Write a protein that binds this DNA or RNA. Structure first.
Length: 290
DNA sequence: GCGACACAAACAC
DNA sequence: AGTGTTTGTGTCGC
């Protein structure tokens, strides 16, 4: 009924089938590590502006809620939240140096203003994009929004336990204890240590996330989870690392820039999950029917 | 099959 | 130790 795997940090992931077993909404058993991500590809090379040294990049993603490993499939529920978190790392460049440097895209060089992550859902069989929606903790009593592009600086990915503990914190003292894990406050650095052209100072806002945290995410409510044959559709969640540049023939999305003009989110790397099954609202997807 | 509303159970404090 | 919060899912009604 419950299959348990030991996580990297010593917590457990407890996989169970909601067709057979109903667990409380807030039980820690709803938190678990989801499917591992795999490289789709690398795109545009990035180089440090004087040395010309290639910046090596790696997305570090994990799902921390919403997916169970049930007999060789990864299974989510349309009605329920998932959590997807990601950082990235630069194996050849320590953070302190990285933030003081400046970087170009090797397409012919476009200056990187900042690095950012976006997420996407796709039909894994035909590459069609599927809309995602997020809620706040207030859910129907608050706004719905689509996942946004998240400016980020390189950081280790927090342990599963940490994501779990920070999920619904309000108290100011607890927030202070997690602040350094999730944010860099540019306004608190010594400005005199930085050149005008430094990467840190072309980020759009003073509060810069170290971790992209997409919580309370769902597939759009209109998504069809079965094919006409009644076979399950296969979905996949994608994490894309990009460099945002000022465009004033490679893969990119347009981005609503800070000053208001047309910006470019140039793809650097993309990872994705293996195929995912999503269970819809049918009564037979729930243990109540039995 | 979807939007809305309701109930309930463990969490956060 | 009690109050209000968060989120899985039961249900209505179109």
């Amino acid at each position: 009924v419950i299959l348990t795997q030991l996580n990297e940090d010593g917590t457990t992931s407890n996989y169970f089938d909601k067709r057979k077993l109903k667990i409380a909404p807030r039980s820690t058993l709803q938190f678990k590590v989801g499917p591992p991500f795999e490289l789709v590809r690398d795109y545009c090379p990035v180089v440090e502006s004087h040395t010309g040294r290639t910046l090596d990049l790696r997305i570090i993603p994990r799902i921390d809620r919403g997916f169970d490993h049930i007999d060789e499939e990864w299974v989510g529920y349309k009605r329920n939240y998932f959590t997807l978190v990601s950082t990235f790392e630069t194996a050849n460049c320590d953070l302190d140096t990285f933030l003081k440097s400046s970087f170009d895209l090797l397409v012919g060089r476009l200056r990187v203003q900042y690095f950012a992550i976006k997420i996407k859902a796709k039909n894994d069989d035909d590459d069609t994009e599927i809309n995602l929606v997020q809620h706040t903790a207030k859910r129907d009593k608050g706004p719905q929004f689509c996942p946004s592009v998240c400016p980020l600086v390189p950081s280790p990915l927090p342990k599963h336990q940490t994501i779990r503990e920070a999920s619904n914190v309000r108290n100011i003292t607890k927030m202070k204890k997690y602040d350094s894990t999730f944010y860099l406050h540019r306004d608190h650095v010594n400005y005199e240590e930085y050149g005008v052209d430094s990467l840190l100072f072309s980020y759009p806002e003073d509060s810069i996330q170290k971790v992209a945290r997409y919580e309370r995410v769902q597939f759009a409510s209109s998504i069809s989870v079965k094919k006409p044959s009644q076979q399950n559709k296969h979905f996949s969640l994608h994490v894309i690392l990009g460099a945002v540049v000022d465009p004033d023939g490679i893969p990119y999305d347009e981005l609503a820039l800070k000053n208001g003009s047309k910006g470019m989110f140039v793809y650097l790397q993309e990872m994705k999950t293996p195929p995912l099954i999503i269970r819809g609202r049918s009564p037979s997807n729930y243990a109540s029917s039995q």
